[PDB]
Design a protein around this ligand. Structure first.
Ligand SMILES: *[C@@H]1O[C@H](CO)[C@@H](O[C@@H]2O[C@H](CO)[C@@H](O[C@@H]3O[C@H](CO[C@H]4O[C@H](CO)[C@@H](O)[C@H](O[C@H]5O[C@H](CO)[C@@H](O)[C@H](O)[C@@H]5O[C@H]5O[C@H](CO)[C@@H](O)[C@H](O)[C@@H]5O)[C@@H]4O)[C@@H](O)[C@H](O[C@H]4O[C@H](CO)[C@@H](O)[C@H](O)[C@@H]4O[C@H]4O[C@H](CO)[C@@H](O)[C@H](O)[C@@H]4O)[C@@H]3O)[C@H](O)[C@H]2NC(C)=O)[C@H](O)[C@H]1NC(C)=O
Ligand SMILES: Cc1nonc1CNC(=O)C1CCN(c2cccc3c2C(=O)N(CC2CCCCC2)C3=O)CC1
Ligand SMILES: [Ca+2]
Ligand code: NA
Ligand SMILES: [Zn+2]
Length: 805
């Protein structure tokens, strides 16, 4: 209920929200059907339009006008944005040359540079170049400020999840807005764009920037605008707020444009109809910058121009129908479109089985344009699983396509030529970032980065302490002239033991065998040096990873590799080795095919055993350091140590063997040597975080050998590939993956073929950031380099995407 009988006189676009039932005058009142009766009359004036003309200059003030060109307009703060250009001989901001802003130049009374976030929906990254001829204002911000070639959105590349990610620094699984449409089974409530459930605070997790600001004494403009408020009025309102008295004036503001998304859906990303929407957004940026110039704020305010996601070509005819795959189509609910989420139609259905649904959706048609997954099996880079609103069954839809339940859903509810929502590494989904102002760098290009990082920087720009988020604070310090956050390395929690030879062969009863009984003072001294770490500098190039949780582990040294061996999980947490460009791949000799060797540095009680693998009919084993890359026949025996063994499904061994036998050498050759760190991951509760021992759901049968959910590798080399990985003087280059440890290769529709036709395609889909492996392992990598810590933080956030340009 709302008593619309109050008045907005002197209250237009007030900042505090007045409580029910009293009528509101804030920028969101329309959206709640709650504005005072005279809100339109008083607050949404339109008369004479938005621009001053020659003949209005000096006019007597008429308060019915949308904006003013009277002599008193600057003092009142309500001039049309082009007032000083038209009436006082000034230039538009876009016509002034770019001049470095070395220090904030702010009027008296301004305690910090304000932040203005100008967000644009559906603004695909390639617009910045392809539309640059019709967006002069945006091009000036881009070229003169700090810009990325693109910014990576979160998955799904939908509007609500991305905007709230920008505002919170959180993955959708964590902030709760995991799609534009959701069902929450605990609430038993549905969230959708159209309706009022979406206004309930219970959906909205984390702590968005405007709340972080307010709790810490930094006043915020109200970030949300009812859709009918025209852009010119949003810009005028922001400018009015900026002329408020110091005590009353916000320091952070948001503007939002529904374009170019709105037109992109109708016309496709590059339809001829798209030029006008881009001109219009640019015009709006020009109005804002001119208005800041009038207020003497254009060299004081930090402006962020940022998008939520891109736009792809998508038409009705490119739709896959679940009715062509499932018999039981009426027993499911599909959330459709550029992603699919499936759940049972009724919880009283006893005959609902996800496994049958998945199988009926797996590799059924040759050109199939979607792939089903249990959500825990999605690529971990997506971070799209740990929320009760994400359905167990997910369909990753190919770019350019839709999935729907039945054909009648697509003509009873073409027209649209664009859509978004696909995998966030897809080029067409990439979006924009530009920062301009005293706190940002001048004429600086920075590499692509992920939108989850921005909340930290916005907090940095305002002097705020960020709420806990998924950003890596400091990884974007290279965007800033000042206000950087100087993080320190986390402290190591567990120190390693350095075991020497402590056990005789006969103390072990592992049921393993190896044909290794054949055997100086010469190299016998050398093999002793090797076991004490004499070659460690070659194979551990950036220091030992630090263990950031309490545990018991041993550093083990070898000629060709070093490892951190966990006595709790009975396998290495990490195994580190360097392969030079000149390295030679060799076979496993016939007499060593099944060789496993007890490690005389590690007790029988903390070792795996071969008997468990023999008796577990589903589970085989693999090695972390690959025997195929031994430096010599004698060193090869180290690779068969029981302490280098890890459990692997035969199906997964196909992938792992091809990576180790073929791809590592390929990478060393292409990158001029590589350093590889490999290890297991345990994430049975799919929360992106290292599992404790009591969360492990599966062991090698009859034993305490835990089965990893994933195996990772971090592959580092010199960015300047004219230097070898092991003698690099400058920045590093990295690529990593988190491969799911699955008992089949159903994920790969061509897996019956030779590994050369499908394994690398799988690894690419499962590319990861080092930071992702850190969360999943409780390890901290790159502890000892010659590089600045922030550069290293950036490296750890890097994702190698394998997309074209
Ligand atoms: C990305 O960054 C984010 C933010 O840093 C990381 O998320 C954090 O991870 C922590 C570990 O998982 C987690 O810490 C827990 O907090 C619990 C209380 O949390 C509430 O209060 C906070 C603070 O304001 C609030 O933010 C939380 O918000 C969640 O839930 C609300 C609804 O209540 C949602 O609106 C919101 O979106 C959010 O949901 C998200 O997180 C929850 C988990 O909290 C998920 O379930 C959702 O799907 C969604 O992802 C909460 O309101 C606290 O109770 C926990 O402590 C338990 O465990 C410890 C273990 O030592 C133990 O000491 C305690 O006893 C306790 O166990 C007891 O409860 C158990 C469960 O019922 C029970 O099994 C036991 O037997 C015990 O009874 C814990 O401290 C933190 O909440 C989140 N923060 C956020 C914002 O999500 C995230 O990890 C990062 N991602 C990556 C990959 O790095
Ligand atoms: C019905 C209704 N209620 O309010 N307004 C309307 C009508 N308008 C819309 O529907 C717009 C499109 C969705 N939209 C969202 C959606 C979900 C989360 C956020 C936003 C948003 O703008 N910000 C601010 C960040 C923008 C990006 C920069 C950081 C802050 C979020 O956090 C902005 C409003
Ligand atoms: Ca976990
Ligand atoms: Na297959
Ligand atoms: Zn859209």
């Amino acid at each position: 209920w709302t008593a619309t009988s109050g008045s907005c006189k002197g209250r237009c676009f007030e900042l505090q929200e007045v409580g029910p039932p009293d009528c509101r005058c804030d920028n969101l009142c329309k959206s709640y059907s709650s504005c005072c009766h005279d809100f339109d009359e008083l607050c949404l004036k339109t008369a004479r339009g938005w621009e001053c003309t020659k003949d209005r200059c000096g006019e007597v003030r008429n308060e019915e006008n949308a904006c003013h060109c009277s002599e008193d307009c600057l003092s009142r703060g309500d001039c049309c944005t082009n007032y000083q250009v038209v009436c006082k001989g000034e230039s538009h901001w876009v016509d002034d040359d770019c001049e470095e802003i070395k220090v904030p130049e702010c009027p008296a009374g301004f305690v910090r540079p304000p932040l203005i976030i100008f967000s644009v929906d559906g603004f695909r990254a390639s617009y910045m170049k392809k539309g640059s001829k019709v967006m002069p204002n945006i091009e000036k911000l881009r070229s003169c400020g700090t810009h990325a070639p693109y910014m990576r959105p979160v998955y799904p590349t939908k509007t609500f999840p991305n905007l709230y990610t920008l505002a919170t620094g959180l993955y959708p699984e964590s902030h709760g807005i995991v799609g534009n449409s959701m069902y929450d089974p605990v609430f038993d409530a549905s969230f959708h764009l159209r309706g009022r459930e979406k206004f309930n605070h219970r959906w909205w997790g984390g702590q968005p920037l405007w709340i972080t600001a307010t709790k810490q004494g930094v006043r915020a403009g109200t970030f949300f605008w009812s859709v009918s408020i025209p852009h010119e009025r949003r810009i005028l309102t922001i400018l009015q707020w900026l002329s408020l008295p110091d005590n009353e004036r916000p320091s952070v503001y948001a503007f939002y444009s529904e374009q170019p998304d709105f037109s992109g859906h109708k016309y496709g990303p590059f339809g001829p109809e798209m030029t006008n929407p881009l001109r219009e957004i640019d015009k709006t940026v020009g109005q804002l910058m001119d208005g800041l110039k009038q207020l003497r704020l254009h060299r004081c305010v930090n402006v962020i121009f940022v998008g939520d996601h891109g736009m792809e070509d998508v038409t009705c005819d490119r739709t896959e129908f679940l009715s062509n795959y499932l018999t039981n189509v009426d027993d499911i609910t599909l959330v459709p479109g550029t992603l699919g989420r499936i759940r049972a139609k009724s919880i009283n259905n006893s005959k609902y089985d996800p496994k049958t649904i998945i199988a009926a959706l797996t590799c059924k048609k040759p050109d199939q344009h979607f792939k089903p997954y249990m959500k825990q099996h999605l690529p971990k880079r997506l971070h799209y699983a740990n929320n009760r609103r994400i359905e167990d069954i997910h369909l990753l839809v190919d770019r350019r396509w839709h999935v729907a339940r039945k054909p009648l859903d697509v003509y009873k509810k073409c027209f649209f030529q664009g859509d978004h929502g696909f995998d966030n590494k897809v080029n067409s989904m990439q979006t924009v970032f530009v920062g301009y102002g005293p706190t940002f760098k001048y004429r600086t290009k920075v590499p692509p980065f992920e939108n989850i990082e921005l909340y930290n920087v916005m907090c940095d720009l305002l002097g705020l302490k960020p709420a806990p988020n998924n950003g890596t604070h400091g990884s974007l310090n290279h965007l800033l002239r000042t206000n950087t956050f100087r993080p320190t390395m986390p402290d190591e929690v567990s120190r390693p033991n350095y075991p020497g030879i402590m056990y005789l062969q006969s103390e072990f009863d592992l049921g393993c065998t190896c044909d290794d009984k054949v055997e100086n003072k010469l190299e016998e001294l050398n093999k002793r040096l090797h076991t004490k770490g004499s070659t460690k500098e070659r194979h551990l190039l950036y220091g030992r990873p630090a263990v950031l949780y309490r545990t018991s582990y041993d550093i083990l040294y070898h000629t060709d590799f070093e490892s951190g061996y966990s006595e709790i999980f009975l396998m290495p947490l990490w195994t580190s080795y360097t392969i030079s460009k000149q390295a030679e791949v060799s076979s496993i000799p016939e007499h060593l095919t099944n060789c496993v060797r007890p490690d005389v540095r590690v007790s029988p009680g903390f070792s795996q055993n071969c008997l468990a693998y023999k008796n577990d009919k589903q589970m085989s084993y693999g090695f972390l350091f690959p025997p195929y890359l031994s430096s010599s026949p004698e060193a090869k025996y180290d690779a068969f140590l029981v302490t280098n063994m890890v459990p692997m499904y035969p199906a997964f061994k196909r992938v792992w063997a091809y990576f180790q036998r073929v791809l590592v050498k390929k990478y060393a050759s292409e990158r001029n040597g590589v350093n590889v760190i490999s290890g297991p991951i345990f994430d049975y509760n799919y929360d992106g975080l290292r599992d404790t021992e009591d969360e492990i759901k599966q062991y090698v049968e009859g034993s305490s050998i835990p089965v990893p959910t994933h195996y990772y590798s971090i592959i580092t080399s010199c960015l300047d590939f004219t230097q070898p990985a092991d003698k690099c003087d400058g920045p590093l280059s990295v690529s990593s993956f988190i491969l799911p440890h699955r008992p089949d290769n159903d994920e790969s529709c061509n897996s019956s073929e030779d590994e050369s036709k499908w394994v690398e395609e799988l690894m690419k889909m499962h590319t990861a950031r080092v930071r992702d492996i850190e969360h999943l392992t409780g390890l901290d990598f790159y502890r000892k380099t010659s590089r600045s810590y922030s550069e290293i933080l950036t490296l750890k956030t890097y994702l190698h995407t394998y997309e074209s340009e």
